[PDB]
Design a protein around this ligand. Structure first.
Ligand SMILES: *[C@@H]1O[C@H](CO)[C@@H](O[C@@H]2O[C@H](CO)[C@@H](O[C@@H]3O[C@H](CO)[C@@H](O)[C@H](O)[C@@H]3O)[C@H](O)[C@H]2NC(C)=O)[C@H](O)[C@H]1NC(C)=O
Ligand SMILES: *[C@@H]1O[C@H](CO)[C@@H](O[C@@H]2O[C@H](CO)[C@@H](O[C@@H]3O[C@H](CO)[C@@H](O)[C@H](O)[C@@H]3O)[C@H](O)[C@H]2NC(C)=O)[C@H](O)[C@H]1NC(C)=O
Lengths: 211, 209
C-alpha cells in the first residue's frame, strides 16, 4: 500500500541485514511493528509505540535495532543472522481511525562457503597419464558455490553433498596430462557465490618434473 | 481468543442491537475497534483509542454509541438498523507489544411484518356460497410471516408475494359458509414471525345478517 518495503531480501548467516519500512499513510499512527509468519499465526519481531517505546520479542532480543525514533520509519536491522531468520516478515502500521495496513518482505538466508585450494596427491610426471593436479573445495555454503577454473591446461570433475541445514559442499578436481607446454603455468580456482562481495580466487604454479 | 463476544446476533430493521465485546487480554491495550468484513478486507465501524477518543465510520455515523469509556469494554449499540448492517463483524483489540486479537459476531437483520385485519368485501348472508369473512395481511416482513386462524368456522386461502429487498407479503383470506350458528362468534388472526416477541392477534365478532 503506502507501506514501502523491499519485497525480497537476502541475509548472510552470522552477519547483519536491514529490514526497510517507510510509512507514508498520512494518517494518525497508533503503533508500528514487524511480525513473522508462522503457519497462519504471526509472531511479533519488534513494536514501536509512541508512548510505550520499542519492544523486541522472542529470539530476536539482543539482535534487533530500530533505526530511529520516527513513527513513519519502521526500519530495523537484524544481527547474528541464523537459519531461523529466513521466512516472510510483515511490516504493519496500525492507524487511527482506519486501522491496520501492511506489506511483506521475504528473507532468504545465505551462508558463505569455506574455500580452500590444495595440490593433488600425486606428482605430475611429463608424458604421464591424466593426473589430478589440484582440488578446490567450497564447503558448506548456502546455496552451493560455483567453481570454475582458469588456465586451459585440463578438465574439471566435481561432486556436491547437500546437508540437512541446506548448505552444500562442492569438491572440484582439476585433471590434466602433464606436458612441457603446461610447465611453469598457473592454474586458478574461481569460486562464485551470492554471499561474496567478490569471487574467491586461489592459484599456484604447476610443478612438472623430470623422467 | 481472549475477545468475548456473541457468535450470532439477530437485529430488527429500524430498531436497536448491542454488539457485545469484553477485552481483558492481560497486556497494555493500544486501541480497540469493531470492523465489518467486506470481501477479504475489513471496514472500520468504530474505534476507541485512549488518547484520540471514539470514532465512527461510514454509514454508521449517528447510529453507533460506545457503551463506556473503558478500554476493556468495546461494546457498542447500533440504531436505525438497516439491511446493510447485516453481515459479519469482528471485535478487535490491538495490544502492546504482542499486537491484535479478535473474534467475530454475525448479524442477521429481520423486518417486522405490518399486520392488518379487514372484514372482507361482501356482506355475510346465510346458507349460501363461500364468502370471505376476513382478510389478514402480514406485509413486507423478513422472512415471510405465517398466518393461522382461531375459531373453527371455515378454511383459509393464502398467497405470498416476494420483493427485491427480501421482504415478503402474505395475504390470508378466511372463507366460510355463513350460518345463524356463527353469529356472536369471534374469528381471530394469528401471525407468527421471528421479529415478534409474541404472535400478533387481531379478532372480531362475526356479524351474520
Ligand atoms: C550446516 O551443516 C554442516 C554439516 O554438518 C556443518 O558442517 C560441519 O561443521 C562442523 C563445525 O565447524 C565441522 O567440524 C569442524 O571441522 C573439523 C572436523 O574435522 C575440526 O577441525 C573442527 O574442530 C570441527 O570439528 C564439520 O566438519 C562440518 N561438516 C562438514 C563440513 O561436512 C555446517 O557448519 C552447518 N552450517 C551452519 C551455518 O550451521
Ligand atoms: C421492502 O420492499 C417493499 C417494496 O419496495 C417496500 O414496501 C412499500 O413500502 C412503501 C412505504 O412503506 C409503501 O408505499 C408508500 O405508501 C404510502 C401510502 O401509505 C405513500 O405515502 C408513499 O409515498 C409510498 O408510496 C408501499 O405500499 C409498500 N409496497 C408494498 C408492495 O407493500 C418496503 O417498505 C421495503 N421495506 C424495507 C424495510 O426496506
Amino acid at each position: 500500500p503506502s507501506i514501502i518495503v523491499e519485497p525480497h531480501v537476502t541475509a548472510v548467516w552470522g552477519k547483519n541485514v536491514s529490514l526497510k519500512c517507510l510509512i507514508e499513510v498520512n494518517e494518525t499512527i497508533t503503533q508500528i511493528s514487524w511480525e513473522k509468519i508462522h503457519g497462519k499465526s504471526t509472531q511479533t519481531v519488534a513494536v514501536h509505540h509512541p508512548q510505550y517505546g520499542f519492544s523486541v520479542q522472542g529470539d530476536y532480543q539482543g539482535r534487533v535495532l530500530f533505526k530511529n525514533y520516527s513513527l513513519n520509519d519502521a526500519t530495523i536491522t537484524l544481527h547474528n543472522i541464523g537459519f531461523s531468520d529466513s521466512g516472510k516478515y510483515i511490516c504493519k502500521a496500525v492507524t487511527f481511525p482506519l486501522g491496520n495496513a501492511q506489506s511483506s518482505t521475504t528473507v532468504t538466508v545465505l551462508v558463505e562457503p569455506t574455500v580452500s585450494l590444495i595440490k593433488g596427491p600425486d606428482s605430475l610426471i611429463d608424458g604421464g597419464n591424466e593426473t589430478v593436479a589440484a582440488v578446490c573445495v567450497a564447503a558448506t555454503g548456502k546455496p552451493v558455490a560455483q567453481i570454475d577454473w582458469e588456465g586451459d591446461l585440463g578438465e574439471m570433475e566435481s561432486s556436491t553433498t547437500s546437508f540437512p541445514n541446506e548448505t552444500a559442499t562442492i569438491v572440484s578436481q582439476y585433471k590434466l596430462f602433464p606436458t612441457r607446454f603446461a610447465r611453469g603455468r598457473r592454474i586458478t580456482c574461481v569460486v562464485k557465490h551470492p554471499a561474496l562481495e567478490k569471487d574467491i580466487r586461489y592459484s599456484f604454479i604447476l610443478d612438472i618434473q623430470h623422467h
